Every structure is written in C-alpha cells, then in structure tokens.
Design a protein around this ligand. Structure first.
Ligand code: HEM
Ligand code: HEM
Ligand SMILES: [Xe]
Ligand SMILES: [Xe]
Ligand SMILES: [Xe]
Ligand SMILES: [Xe]
Lengths: 137, 137
C-alpha cells in the first residue's frame, strides 16, 4: 500500500527520485521553464549534473515526509502551507503539482512493481486541494 | 510437486504466510479494506502487531490443511463449505479468493524456489469452483 510505497521509495531514494522527476520532465517538457539549466539535455546528461541529483533528492526527501505525515493520503495543512510559502515555489500554481503527480502515477503504473498507484493519485489530488486551501492559485 | 510445496510452506509458515499475504495486499490494494487494522501501516509496522502475525499464520495453516486434504489439487467439499460458512468470510465473493491465488502463484513464480506454481494455480481454480458449488457468490 501507500505506507509501504514510502518505504520502497526511501530504500532507493536517489534512483527513484531521478527516474520519477525525469518521467515528469519528459511527459511535460515545458515544465523545465521553472528550473535552471535543465533544457537541452538528455536524461543521462541531467543525471551527471550534481545539482540535478541534489535537487531531486531534496524534493523526494520532502515528498516522502509529507506522504508519511498524511492520514489516508490526506496531507497536513502545515505541509501544504510550507510548500506554498517556499520562496522557490513563488512562480507555481496547483497545475504544476497536478502534472507532477500524473507523471508519478503513470511511472508507477508503467513499472513491473506493486506500487499502490491509485493511492498516489488520491494523495496528489488531496495535496492540490490542500495547496488551494493554503492559498496557492 | 504440490505435496513438497506444502512441506516447504509449513517449514517456515510465518515467513511465507506474511510474505504471500503482503504480496496479495500490494497487488490488490483495495483488498486491505477487509483488514481495517492493517490500513496505513508499512510491512514492518504490520509485523510488529501481534494479530498480524497470528492471523496470517492461521490463514495459511488452514490453507495448507485444505491443500493437504485435497486429491490431485481438488479440495474436499467439506473444506470448501467451512471457508464459505466462516463468519469472517460473510462479505466475500469468489473473486476475493481468485485474487489471493493470482498473487500466491505470482509470488511462487517470482521466487528463486522450484514451487509447482501450475498446481497452485489449478488448486486455486478448483477451490473457487468448490466455493461456488458450496454457495459462495
Ligand atoms: C510535493 C511536491 C514538491 C515538493 C515536496 C517540492 C520540494 C522542493 C524542495 C525541497 C526544494 C529545494 C531543493 C533544494 O534546495 O535543492 C524545491 C525547489 C524548487 N521547486 Fe519544488 N517541490 C515540489 C513540487 C514542485 C513542482 C511541481 C515544481 C514545478 C513544476 C517545483 C519547482 C521548484 C523550483 C523551480 C525549485 C528551485 C529550483 C531548484 O531547486 O532546482 N516544485 N522544491
Ligand atoms: C483459502 C484461502 C483462505 C483461508 C484458508 C482463510 C482462512 C482464514 C482463517 C483461519 C481466519 C481466522 C484467523 C484467526 O482465527 O485469527 C480468517 C479470517 C479472515 N479472513 Fe480468511 N481465508 C482465506 C481467504 C480469504 C480472503 C481471500 C479474504 C478476503 C480478501 C479473507 C478475509 C478474511 C477476513 C477479513 C478475516 C478476519 C480478519 C482477520 O483475521 O484478519 N479470507 N481467514
Ligand atoms: Xe518537482
Ligand atoms: Xe512540507
Ligand atoms: Xe487472505
Ligand atoms: Xe477449511
């Protein structure tokens, strides 16, 4: 289930973080406009960029905490508040998050793995709802 | 063959019981709804709960009794009847059992072990038929 999936991802965090973020960027290439120096590079090129590995691990480190702190895939309002208020997230709207979780869910479905993809979809939708409540447009 | 697999499973009942049951829940996450006490818990959290180990071992003990009493993977009608009449199984349909046996067979195939996966598949099919013959919807 969802709780076990958190442990699975955490067990191989760098690999999962990079592969899922890449699935996001490749499904939604224009989402690269939010980041610096990701455009014009293949997956292997990105994976050899020190900043890429560091960033994506930090994103998924926090995502797993938000998931772990959730009850029945409903995140804490305090977690939503933090994600809205982060300076690094000032250009974002809930749509950016919708797309990330669509990509993450499709990645899980496309694996040969027993991820609880429906729970991640639910969690993504609930997070978007919480971001809206916390004041993200 | 099938008889050896019964011995293999019985030899380390706790471990196989937990591992196959988790395999079942992770392949068919909606099935966790029947086990309300297991909701929102990782595989390690579950193994620390007294009733998780107890229940799962008792389930697989009974499964092995039924398997051992079968002839050529055909279970006794009385054993089918017991499974149907059980209070704990009142809300179940044959589909629930099919899912369990799909996951069990997948588990056997994925293991490095020379399980007679084909016989377990057949036993599952015959049990479902006997469950139907005994009144289960
Ligand atoms: C629940 C999902 C998300 C989490 C947990 C999260 C978390 C984080 C974290 C921890 C950082 C700081 C990383 C560091 O210091 O290296 C960060 C930075 C950043 N995030 Fe997110 N984020 C999420 C979703 C998004 C989305 C959907 C976008 C846009 C598509 C986005 C855009 C950015 C940008 C532009 C930065 C700064 C640039 C960079 O570090 O490369 N974030 N985020
Ligand atoms: C041949 C297959 C099965 C066998 C041999 C079996 C056997 C058992 C046994 C012995 C118990 C009582 C455990 C105890 O006394 O503590 C039990 C309880 C229960 N069974 Fe089954 N069962 C089977 C299939 C299923 C399936 C497929 C489901 C639904 C997915 C299910 C749902 C339940 C539930 C909800 C309980 C009570 C809660 C619990 O003990 O966890 N059973 N079963
Ligand atoms: Xe992201
Ligand atoms: Xe957060
Ligand atoms: Xe079960
Ligand atoms: Xe039984």
């Amino acid at each position: 289930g969802f709780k076990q999936d958190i442990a699975t991802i955490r067990g191989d965090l760098r690999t999962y973080a990079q592969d899922i973020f890449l699935a996001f960027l490749n499904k939604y290439p224009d989402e690269r406009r939010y980041f610096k120096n990701y455009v014009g590079k293949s997956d292997q090129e990105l994976k050899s960029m020190a900043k890429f590995g560091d960033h994506t691990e930090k994103v998924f480190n926090l995502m797993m905490e938000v998931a772990d702190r959730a009850t029945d895939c409903v995140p804490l309002a305090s977690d939503a508040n933090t994600l809205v208020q982060m300076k690094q997230h000032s250009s974002l709207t809930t749509g950016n998050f919708e797309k990330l979780f669509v990509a993450l869910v499709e990645y899980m479905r496309a694996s040969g793995q027993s991820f609880d993809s429906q729970s991640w979809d639910r969690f993504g939708k609930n997070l978007v709802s919480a971001l809206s409540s916390a004041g993200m447009k």
